């Protein structure tokens, strides 16, 4: 299977994907995040964060309160399954994670934790 995916987060506050499917043959999965546009990280930063559907709101709330200095992610948040760093336009960051942290029959959500972004910048991830 392919065990990676290229995702874009643009100045329109949109991920070019609303749904990700991870193949079971994969032991590891990689997300290559880029950011088309021209806006800076302090006002249009984007990160790719993964958690269970149950944990999303909390990760987003606690991340918002963490500040730009911490990439808007609560330090050592156990609910975060995997995450890229917070990037601005023109930047790139990739993250690889263990697929064994996922199971079938559970809804996972990927989103950006920059203040307010998750309202539009979010999507589903499923192991299949
Ligand atoms: Cu964002």
């Amino acid at each position: 299977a392919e065990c990676s995916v290229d995702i874009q987060g643009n100045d329109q506050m949109q991920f070019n994907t609303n749904a990700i499917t991870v193949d079971k043959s994969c032991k590891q999965f990689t997300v290559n995040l880029s950011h088309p546009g021209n806006l800076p990280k302090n006002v249009m930063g984007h990160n790719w964060v993964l958690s269970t559907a149950a944990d999303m709101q909390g990760v987003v709330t606690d991340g918002m309160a963490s500040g730009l200095d911490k990439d808007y992610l609560k330090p050592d948040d156990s609910r975060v399954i995997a995450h890229t760093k917070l990037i601005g336009s023109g930047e790139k960051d990739s993250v690889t994670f263990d697929v064994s942290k996922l199971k079938e029959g559970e809804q996972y959500m990927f989103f950006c934790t920059f203040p307010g972004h998750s309202a539009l910048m979010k999507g589903t991830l499923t192991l299949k």
Side-chain angles (χ1 to χ4, degrees):
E2 233 307 319
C3 300
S4 72
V5 62
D6 296 356
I7 299 177
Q8 294 175 12
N10 68 15
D11 283 352
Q12 321 316 322
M13 235 163 47
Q14 294 269 12
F15 272 133
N16 66 345
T17 328
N18 289 304
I20 301 174
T21 291
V22 176
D23 194 88
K24 309 201 312 290
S25 72
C26 301
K27 290 195 147 173
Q28 290 180 308
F29 191 74
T30 303
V31 170
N32 302 303
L33 182 71
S34 63
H35 187 328
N38 50 236
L39 277 44
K41 164 179 56 180
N42 67 350
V43 293
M44 197 54 64
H46 294 326
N47 59 10
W48 186 85
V49 186
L50 184 69
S51 77
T52 58
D55 288 335
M56 178 178 73
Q57 177 89 153
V59 172
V60 170
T61 300
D62 291 350
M64 174 207 261
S66 296
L68 173 58
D69 183 38
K70 299 300 184 180
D71 280 358
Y72 290 109
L73 275 177
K74 184 176 81 86
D76 203 81
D77 197 329
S78 61
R79 300 167 302 192
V80 175
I81 299 175
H83 74 82
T84 60
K85 75 189 181 188
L86 183 77
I87 63 167
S89 286
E91 299 191 289
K92 306 207 298 176
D93 195 49
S94 297
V95 64
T96 298
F97 67 89
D98 191 346
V99 185
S100 62
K101 289 172 181 288
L102 312 181
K103 74 175 183 183
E104 299 198 50
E106 186 163 56
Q107 320 286 198
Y108 301 101
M109 297 297 295
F110 65 85
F111 44 90
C112 173
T113 58
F114 184 95
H117 290 193
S118 69
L120 223 52
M121 301 188 79
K122 67 173 195 313
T124 52
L125 185 141
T126 317
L127 174 65
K128 287 153 78 178

